[PDB]
Design a binder for this molecule. Structure first.
Ligand SMILES: [Mg+2]
Ligand SMILES: [Mg+2]
Ligand SMILES: [Mg+2]
Ligand SMILES: [Mg+2]
Ligand SMILES: [Mg+2]
Ligand SMILES: [Mg+2]
Ligand SMILES: [Mg+2]
Ligand SMILES: [Mg+2]
Ligand SMILES: [Mg+2]
Ligand SMILES: [Mg+2]
Ligand SMILES: [Mg+2]
Ligand SMILES: [Mg+2]
Ligand SMILES: [Mg+2]
Ligand SMILES: [Mg+2]
Ligand SMILES: [Mg+2]
Ligand SMILES: [Mg+2]
Length: 109
RNA sequence: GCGUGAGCCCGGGUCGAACGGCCUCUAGUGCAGAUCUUGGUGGUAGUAGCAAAUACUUCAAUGAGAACUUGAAGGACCGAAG
C-alpha cells in the first residue's frame, strides 16, 4: 500500500544499459534510460530530471557516463489543472562520492 | 427506335440563349498513330530518397502546437592560412 507521494533513493547501474552503444549517443541514451528507469519504478510516465542530475550525467563528456549513479526519485502530485496525469516523478542526484554498496532506501523528511 | 454502315431521331438528367430541316453555293470540312503540337493526368509510388562538414542534453518561459524559438546550465566544434 505505497502512498502516491513517496520518495526513494536508487542506484542506477548505467554500465549495463550503456554497454556497447555509440559514443556520440552515450549521454543522451543515459538520460533516456534514467527516464525509463523512473517510469518503471514509479509507474508515472511523467519524469522530470533535475539540472544537477543532468550535470552529473554529462560531467565526463558525451561518452564518460558513470557506471553507477545514485538518484532520489520523488513521486509527487501534479496539481496543474491541465495535467493528463495526476502524478509525476522528479528525480535528482544524491550527494555521494561513490554509489557503491547502497540499497534502495525510502526517504522521508 | 431507325439505318448494312458512316450516322439520324427520341426518353430522362444538367443547363441557360440561341438553333435546325430541305434545294442550291462555299471551304482553313471528318484523326489512333507522324520519337506529331499545346495542355492536362496516371501506374511507377507514399516508392528512390531527405546519410560529407565530430553533437547534443536538462530546466523554464512563450505558444493551439517546440529537436531545429528564447533565457539559464552543461557538453562540444571552429582553434588565429578561423
Ligand atoms: Mg557493439
Ligand atoms: Mg444569359
Ligand atoms: Mg484541315
Ligand atoms: Mg488525338
Ligand atoms: Mg491511320
Ligand atoms: Mg506532352
Ligand atoms: Mg510523370
Ligand atoms: Mg524509404
Ligand atoms: Mg545518399
Ligand atoms: Mg537520417
Ligand atoms: Mg554530419
Ligand atoms: Mg503554456
Ligand atoms: Mg540540432
Ligand atoms: Mg578538427
Ligand atoms: Mg578543438
Ligand atoms: Mg597571414
Amino acid at each position: 500500500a505505497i502512498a502516491d507521494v513517496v520518495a526513494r533513493e536508487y542506484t542506477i547501474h548505467l554500465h549495463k544499459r550503456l554497454h556497447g552503444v555509440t559514443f556520440k549517443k552515450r549521454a543522451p541514451r543515459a538520460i533516456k534510460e534514467i527516464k525509463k528507469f523512473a517510469q518503471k519504478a514509479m509507474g508515472t510516465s511523467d519524469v522530470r530530471l533535475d539540472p544537477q542530475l543532468n550535470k552529473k550525467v554529462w560531467e565526463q563528456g558525451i561518452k564518460g557516463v558513470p557506471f553507477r549513479i545514485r538518484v532520489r526519485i520523488s513521486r509527487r502530485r501534479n496539481d496543474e489543472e491541465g495535467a493528463k496525469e495526476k502524478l509525476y516523478s522528479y528525480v535528482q542526484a544524491v550527494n555521494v562520492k561513490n554509489p557503491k554498496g547502497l540499497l534502495t532506501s525510502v526517504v522521508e523528511e
